[PDB]
Design a protein around this ligand. Structure first.
Ligand code: FE
Ligand code: FE
Lengths: 674, 679
């Protein structure tokens, strides 16, 4: 019994079927593979096409999942898709009316076209099963919990009919108890509010991280006008007829000034985030207070995109409404993709389910075997030095104790947005300056942003207040108080309100990462590490060996630990040996606008990435000429001979484009199949 | 009291405050000037920046209005803006959250910045007045009707609160009787449906022209699921939770195929337009039946953008619900901008109103004086031949009788979308094949689109059935039946259903154009001409003399009559002497895409216009190199020397870009400031 689950839209690698999708539910394209009830492979497409939260059809992810499972396309019994057919096709039809050039191709024909052209897989129509969106969410969240009965809450932006659904789960049967209509969306409310802080889709958890810096009293009475709590667990959101955003009109009327991009977060912005967070908490806890006592369940599974609000999950934990709470590592639409596979399986016979509670999210492609990793590190020799210690974990723990910031790359990549010890950046959690520097110099992000700790399961209750219900802390699902007597000790990982989005790692959840944290604890007295995701501000979490080395070289990390090899940057790295390649979305432009006296303005040159929200950067006339000759095989040194050799200016200009990931730079060849 | 009326968004000529505005009510930007109760000047910005239905701040429209009034900016007593302030600023504020790079500048600051930077005008805050949107529509329509009381109906996409409003007007007072909420918009319903036909905003009139070719029975039961008529003149439009379009989901569910770009209009598409038109007619007649009976009134002014549905207007006229119906030449948001001026004047003092029903839309800038025009046609000498007849109108009437298709440019340009004898293309209305000959050669549009006739006041009733009420026909607001015994005679201007969108011209509405049609009638026995707008498929109606000559030279028009000069194209016109100029939105680009092997793809070259929905076109490497040296003074022939000379290929390629108006091409110099013609 082998079933594939899909989400996302249908565009190929270089083109978009339609420029703007105008919906929130096509993001985080992914593929999941279920065999005999167990989740054997799952990866988000963003890890493979390097476009954060991409909508593109998850073609590379399907291929990787099949390889990981040892399966061929013909072996797959069924494909589930995370939304019902008629809704998707109606949405496509509407987009085709506003893009009249696009051919009338609906989702069934598009899925099968992508699988046929991409994998040589002719999918029969009876094997493609479309699934109600919140049912797929609920299957994913509940079936991985280890629980045999539970209340299941789904909250996101929207499914086909509803923004929220409440289920009873028993054995493998779901029965709906409640739903909430689309204009009542709490995902929509939170995103509407996120736009007021100069952010967009995907930034909601940064807003969540900003909230503890704010006073929730300033805007409590304003947010009170946007929602009403009603009897029997009901609620209402008050719309307006002015704009497609619930929040901005009332806040404009009282003088709120939305943050411009690249500008600081004022106290008013912080206060705004704080009152937003409180508002969503009060509403969710209102829903759960009613449905806990009504349904009689002492256990909760919480899924949908809103279940990535770690603060909300911490409040749910502390509330006492449930004895046990479970959250899945990928609760946004990639998790609905996986749930679609279970629902498609349920429609073709009795449903096989997981035997145990999910403990590791390490489910994507690995980095490669020992021999191919060593050989590929040798190709990078002009840029790195490699040591091979006897006990890499023992050496890493000592480097951490000495104050070094480490890249850490092992095994199969994490499914869902959190790094958990397979694609991570770790450091000593004690000094507050580590938060300041790793924000400013390493991750290059805003100084308000918190950092999350990983602790050994044996020491967790020495440092963190887990009390209340039993929640699962293997995937950093819950924000949790740091014990007051440990907040000074844990200076880098204690947020301004005394909390921490904690990962509790065990020998069972992650044997190697647990050993690293335990050993660091023995050397220092403190078995806690800062754990942030291994990526710079221009990319999703690194996936391949070349991604890891590239990211190590374009971040300011002290040393990289990848599959027991210790990697450091050379004193002077030779960028000339790197082979430039366009990404499928890379574009090069020479542009003239109107100038004075209706002349043609002066030339400018620009590189950009062709997808909705893609960045762009100016390029010099000389680099523009160099980049025009990129053939995908010639090194950068040899390419630069034409423009008169690789100067320091060009190497430096090229390094900055590499760091923003406008093109791909890597030694000749590749690591080969894993 | 001198009062300026404004509509539109706030962008400068070359840049856009934000790329996409996401609303429908910023289009047709325009300026209007009011003095002592009378409309003394009005022009849409599209005529001056040459962008159809443009949203850009109408800085040029204001400048031209001030010059026609003989006023400094500082003489203006008040400025009225066509929407309430909080609504506009809430929309801007929302756009700023979608575009977090845009600085936080709201309408009051933006209006004042544009006037200050554009005209040196320091507008004091107490002179800027914001106006309820449907009141602005109502003032504009009612105050120019000449009636002393009327039922007033405004229907459009939306104002701040409503998609529709009903008023009783009397004297200068408006009293609201009813309103309809935004999601019930009939302008919105019509635009939603128009998208299913491969069209977009602005193309509603094309859908209205297609509707008579279709059978309305086919989709009548489908549209009936989307609306419900109710008691007391109420209706409901049934929404959905899937997409922001009322129409497409139900039609998808029944197998409708939305028309693709460049496809033919199938029979399904034709029936769809027919049933859509009938649906909107039914709903509006439902509204008007109730409010005629309830108000007891015999007179109707109809305004708002839906009032440009002349087929609907013809059905109101025939309904017998009213004795008198008036419709303003600019009933879309450029009319709201005009009405904002009157509302600003009422807001601060008593309100002066026009003394008479508006008979002429000839309110934009003129072409210039005789000396300026002849000196500038001399600048065009290497491309045109110019005669100077004794009686230009007599000559023109003779040429039309011989079968020539004329361009006709005189005096001040028409306010509103219809050409009415000041920027027109006219031809004999009898030959049926003048439709295909003008639709395919001079306008290059779709064959199904009819042409509209102009007829003298004296002859009108001999050819058209005007009955059912006294409507105003000086602006082509009404579609009317052509009398059955005249149809075959009027082959070029009779639609498939035997109707026509007629202009009745009089010695009062337009003396010169009346004289032309009357004289052509004496020559031929049929005092009726075809009258279409003077523009090709890529421009709004021509404005200046250079616009008129440029458009003549890039279509297949036989002769141009412009201010008593008779203009013909030379045998081989020398394109080399024209000076190329970028437009503010012109962009020139070399692109490289990613090759299939992760290489840089081969370089292509493109010219395009930087506004939402702007066209693009590929250019050759040699034309790319040439256009990159455009400096605004050097001629095209001299620029071509750097790439080997102005070969035939290059001249042909440049000409096609000129037809699409990607760049400005005109003789060195300028016609100069428009001369005071003493009016
Ligand atoms: Fe979802
Ligand atoms: Fe309007």
């Amino acid at each position: 019994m082998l079933v594939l689950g899909l989400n996302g839209n249908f565009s190929a690698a270089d083109t978009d079927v339609v420029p703007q999708l105008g919906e929130v539910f096509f993001h985080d394209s992914a593929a999941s593979l279920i065999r005999d009830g167990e989740l054997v492979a799952a990866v988000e497409e963003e890890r493979l096409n390097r476009i954060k939260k991409t909508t593109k059809f998850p073609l590379n992810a399907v291929r990787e999942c099949l390889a990981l499972a040892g399966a061929r396309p013909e072996d797959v019994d069924a494909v589930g898709y995370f939304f019902p057919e008629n809704h998707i096709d109606t949405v496509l039809n509407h987009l085709y009316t506003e893009y009249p050039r696009a051919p009338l191709r609906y989702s069934r024909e598009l899925i099968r076209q992508r699988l046929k052209e991409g994998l040589g897989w002719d999918l029969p129509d009876e094997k493609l099963v479309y699934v109600p969106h919140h049912e797929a969410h609920a299957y994913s969240s509940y079936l991985h919990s280890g629980m045999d009965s539970a209340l299941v809450l789904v909250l996101d932006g929207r499914g086909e009919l509803h923004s929220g659904t409440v289920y009873r789960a028993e054995g493998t049967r779901l029965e709906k108890l409640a739903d909430y209509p689309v204009p009542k969306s709490l995902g929509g409310l939170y995103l509407n509010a996120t736009y007021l802080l100069g952010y967009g889709f995907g930034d909601e958890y940064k807003v969540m991280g900003l909230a503890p810096w704010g006073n929730p009293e300033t805007y409590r009475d304003t947010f009170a006008k946007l929602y009403t709590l009603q009897d029997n667990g009901e609620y209402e959101l008050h719309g307006n007829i002015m704009v497609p955003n619930l929040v901005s009109p009332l806040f404009y009327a009282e003088g709120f000034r939305p943050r411009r991009k690249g500008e600081p977060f004022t106290q008013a912005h912080r206060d705004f985030a704080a009152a937003l967070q409180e508002t969503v908490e009060k509403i969710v806890l209102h829903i759960l207070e009613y449905w806990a006592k009504t349904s009689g369940h002492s256990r909760l599974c919480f899924g949908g995109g809103v279940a990535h609000n770690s603060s909300l999950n911490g409040l749910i934990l502390k509330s006492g409404l449930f004895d046990e709470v479970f959250v899945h590592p990928a609760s946004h639409d990639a998790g609905a993709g996986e749930g679609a596979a279970y629902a498609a399986a349920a429609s073709l016979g009795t449903l096989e389910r997981p035997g145990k509670r999910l403990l590791s999210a390490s489910l994507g492609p690995a980095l490669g075997g020992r021999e191919q990793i060593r050989a590929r590190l040798a190709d990078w020799a002009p840029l790195i030095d490699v040591e091979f210690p006897d006990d890499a974990v023992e050496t890493a723990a000592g480097l951490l104790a000495e104050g070094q910031v480490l890249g850490w790359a092992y095994g199969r990549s994490e499914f869902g947005p959190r790094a958990l010890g397979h694609r991570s950046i770790v450091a000593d959690a004690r000094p507050e300056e580590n938060r300041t520097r790793i924000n400013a110099m390493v991750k290059k992000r805003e100084g308000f942003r918190p950092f999350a700790p990983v602790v050994t399961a044996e020491a967790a209750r020495d440092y963190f207040d887990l009390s209340g219900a039993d929640g699962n802390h293997e995937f950093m699902s819950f924000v949790v108080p740091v014990l007051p007597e440990r907040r000074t000790e844990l200076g880098a990982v204690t947020h301004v309100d005394g909390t921490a989005r904690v990962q509790v790692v065990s020998a069972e959840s992650g044997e190697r990462f647990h050993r690293l944290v335990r050993r660091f604890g023995e050397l220092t007295g403190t078995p806690v590490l800062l754990n942030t995701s291994f990526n710079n501000n221009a990319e999703p979490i690194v996936q391949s060996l070349d991604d890891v080395v590239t990211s190590f070289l374009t971040t300011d990390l002290d040393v990289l630990v990848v599959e027991d090899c210790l990697v450091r940057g050379k004193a002077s790295p030779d960028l000339g040996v790197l082979v430039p390649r366009f990404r499928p979305v890379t574009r090069l432009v020479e542009r003239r606008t109107a100038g004075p006296d209706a002349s043609a303005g002066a030339k400018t040159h620009e590189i950009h990435l062709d997808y909705d929200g893609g960045p762009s950067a100016k390029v010099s006339p000389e680099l523009y000429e160099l980049l025009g000759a990129v053939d995908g095989t010639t090194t950068l040194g040899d390419l630069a001979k034409t423009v008169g050799g690789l100067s320091d200016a060009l190497a430096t200009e090229v390094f900055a484009l590499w760091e923003q990931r406008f093109l791909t730079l890597a030694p000749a060849g590749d690591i080969g199949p894993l």
